[PDB]
Pre-glycoprotein polyprotein GP complex (Whitewater Arroyo mammarenavirus), 146 residues
Amino acid sequence: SYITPYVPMPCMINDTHFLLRGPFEASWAIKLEITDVTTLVVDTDNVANPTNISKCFANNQDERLLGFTMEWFLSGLEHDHHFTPQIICGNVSKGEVNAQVNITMEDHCSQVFLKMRRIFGVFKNPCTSHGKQNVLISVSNWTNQC
Ligand SMILES: *[C@@H]1O[C@H](CO)[C@@H](O)[C@H](O)[C@H]1NC(C)=O
Ligand SMILES: *[C@@H]1O[C@H](CO)[C@@H](O)[C@H](O)[C@H]1NC(C)=O
Ligand SMILES: *[C@@H]1O[C@H](CO)[C@@H](O)[C@H](O)[C@H]1NC(C)=O
């Protein structure tokens, strides 16, 4: 099989905060926050799915590398047709997160949790408790957090 060179550096802040440092020691990092706070609402122009979630990083610099990193991150979940979380792109120029991933479904939450547990290791299971659950994806600056 083929080995991608665009593998980020994972680092876990805590049970709900995670970072994927852009490959080749980039000056940026993908920020993943597990939270039940809804920040984004469905709009006629911002709906996305796992197949074109890269379009939530259009106006960003080095958008190619961001797309490659998100591609690495979503391996094994996008190919799944039974993994259909609502994904809402956000206006980064207005201060919104790059993407909001609806993981309210027990199965979607379970899949995201298992992928992130393969990446970062053991942490608190967010799907035990019911209710709304989201993964907010943004791009933050690397300040040598780890
Ligand atoms: C997890 O880390 C973030 C980032 O520093 C912080 O805002 C948040 O309060 C932390 N959560 C807990 C439960 O400590
Ligand atoms: C992703 O593709 C769907 C159709 O498959 C489309 O409706 C949606 O607008 C696309 N996402 C973006 C951000 O353009
Ligand atoms: C997330 O999904 C649930 C059910 O799948 C839905 O009730 C909720 O409205 C969705 N979130 C948003 C912001 O639309």
Residues 1-146 form one domain. The chain has one domain: 1-146.
